[PDB]
Design a binder for this molecule. Sequence first.
Ligand code: CL
Ligand code: CL
Length: 108
Amino acid sequence: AQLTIEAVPSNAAEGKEVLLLVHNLPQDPRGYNWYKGETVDANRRIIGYVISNQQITPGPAYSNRETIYPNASLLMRNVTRNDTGSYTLQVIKLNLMSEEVTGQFSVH
Ligand SMILES: [Cl-]
Ligand SMILES: [Cl-]
């Protein structure tokens, strides 16, 4: 029932790929946004997706290493030590309320 993030892997080597898999989405969300860190913070928004017109919304923290998938999951290519940390997903629900979940991974 509860929204979760699963980092695959949770500890990556430099130059490799990390997946942030999203589980237990509501039905009928309006969209998603990813943020670096622990909270919704516009200045740290990486990328989002607006479902109604399948619009990808790169944010101030966007890197061309990242791709967002329709199920909200995030693929990050060519990871570096600086990518280590927390990542927060905002799901915008049908009724325009937002729910958040925070995950993390490390790069060595
Ligand atoms: Cl962080
Ligand atoms: Cl995590």
